[PDB]
Amino acid sequence: RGLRRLGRKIAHGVKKYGPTVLRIIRIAG
Numbered sequence: 225r226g227l228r229r230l231g232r233k234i235a236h237g238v239k240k241y242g243p244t245v246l247r248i249i250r251i252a253g
Contacts, residue, residue, distance in 0.1 A: 228247055232247065233247055237249075237252070
């Protein structure tokens with residue numbers, strides 16, 4: 225769980241979260 229562009233960028237924070245943040249905001253307010 226390190227990748228953050230090789231594949232873990234498009235999803236992550238949406239597929240598991242719902243919104244999209246995380247790998248973009250990594251905050252999710």
